[PDB]
Amino acid sequence: LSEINLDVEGSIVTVKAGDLFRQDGFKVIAFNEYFDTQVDDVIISHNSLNGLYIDNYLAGSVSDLDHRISNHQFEEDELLEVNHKRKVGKTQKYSLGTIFVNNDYLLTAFSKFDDKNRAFLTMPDYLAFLINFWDKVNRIYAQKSVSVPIFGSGITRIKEHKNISDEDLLKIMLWTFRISEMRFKFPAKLTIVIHKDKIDKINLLDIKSARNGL
Amino acid sequence: LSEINLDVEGSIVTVKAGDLFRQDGFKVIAFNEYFDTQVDDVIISHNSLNGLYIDNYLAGSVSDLDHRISNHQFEEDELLEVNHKRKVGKTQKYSLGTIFVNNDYLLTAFSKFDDKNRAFLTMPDYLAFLINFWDKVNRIYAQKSVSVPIFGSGITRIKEHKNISDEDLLKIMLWTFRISEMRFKFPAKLTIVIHKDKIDKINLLDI
């Protein structure tokens, strides 16, 4: 079984094996809190989806995107404090769930970076990113297709849940999307794209319950 | 029906109709971020579970409790800022999920208060409180009985979710608890208590 459609409180949500970059419509790439763009296996890694987007899929130079983000008008709440101590990498912190749209890609600030440029989140941070993100897309991209990976199944560490399964992350994503879409009467059309090789690990049948919040 | 036991990650979580104050073991009362104690229908309502506890069940004086909390030594993360502008009530703010023990009662910092002193939470606040709260009780009160109400099903307003239902709050509580106990060999023994007048609108059968 490689695809499932579920009714989540009135909206059809699709979970399917595939390649995110082959999806038509809006595609979500998970960046870090600084919206770093330097793929040198030091800040951003070449195996991440964040570095893979920049390496082979970004339109234009990395230097052009940096200036588009630097000269972008983020809400007063989406802008955080500036880490002047950051040695290697950008300095402006952004609040999780922040979205910078770039052609048909939604670059979202997902993971945090510690003093040792390690990608991490706490479970409260993870659930808070999801709720904020789901709010922004259901509000801004109502009725538009949005395709997302399994947030946090890559190198991002969820503190104290290092062994969390992609199947648990997937259920959480559906629980938090339900909480969000239930306040919107025309939410986004959500597709969760699972890497074709990882789909054999996940039992899509263990997830259907999350469409009702359990 | 009125009671169900759920096999959550191997642990049993009881959901029952009844009166929280009649439970054996630990009973959780939700306070605000300042741990205020002035039941006066402006900063703490006399109808809230917070008010009923202080008015009808607090063993000791409110002053004994305020001072005991003041002189209590929380963690460094649990102690946040100090609203000096605070026109009324305590000024020390605590991080949601902080617990102060008071006999067989766990007084936990749950709701936030605004300028008008409205009890409120963002949905990310609510989920963060639960994860931070569950982790504390699963670590400190492992194998001990902890009874709780449905957090958020009272005067507290979850922003953008003014009309969230008690059944939906119960569902959030149950899967945020699962995430928590996941990382504990011996979690706490959780009993979620619903008020008899609300088990009609909630179908524990569904769940």
Author numbering:
A (entry chain A): 65 to 278
B (entry chain B): 65 to 271
What does the paper say about this structure?
The ThsB genes encode Toll/interleukin-1 receptor (TIR) domain–containing proteins responsible for phage detection, while the ThsA gene encodes an Abi-triggering effector protein. Two ThsA effector variants have been reported: a silent information regulator (SIR2) and SMF/DprA-LOG (SLOG) domain–containing effector (ThsASIR2-SLOG) and a transmembrane (TM) and macro domain–containing effector protein (ThsATM-macro). Collectively, our biochemical and structural data demonstrate that the nucleotide signaling requirements for ThsASIR2-SLOG and ThsATM-macro effectors are distinct and suggest that ThsATM-macro effectors can trigger Abi via membrane perturbation by a mechanism that involves nucleotide-induced oligomerization of its macro domain.
The Thoeris defense system in E. coli CFT073 consists of a TM-macro ThsA effector (EcThsA) and two TIR domain–containing ThsB proteins (EcThsB1 and EcThsB2). To define the structural basis for ADPR binding to EcThsAMacro, we crystallized and determined structures of this protein in ligand-free state and in complex with ADPR via soaking, at 2.7- and 2.1-Å resolution, respectively. EcThsAMacro exists as a stable dimer in solution, as characterized by size exclusion chromatography–coupled multiangle light scattering (SEC-MALS), and forms a symmetric u-shaped dimer in the asymmetric unit of the crystal. In EcThsAMacro, the dimer-dimer interfaces are predominantly composed of residues from the β6-β7 hairpin and the β3-α2, β8-α6, α5-β8, and α6-β9 loops, with a total buried surface area of 1060 Å2. In summary, our data support a mechanism where ThsATM-macro exists as an inactive dimer and subsequently oligomerizes within the membrane upon nucleotide binding.
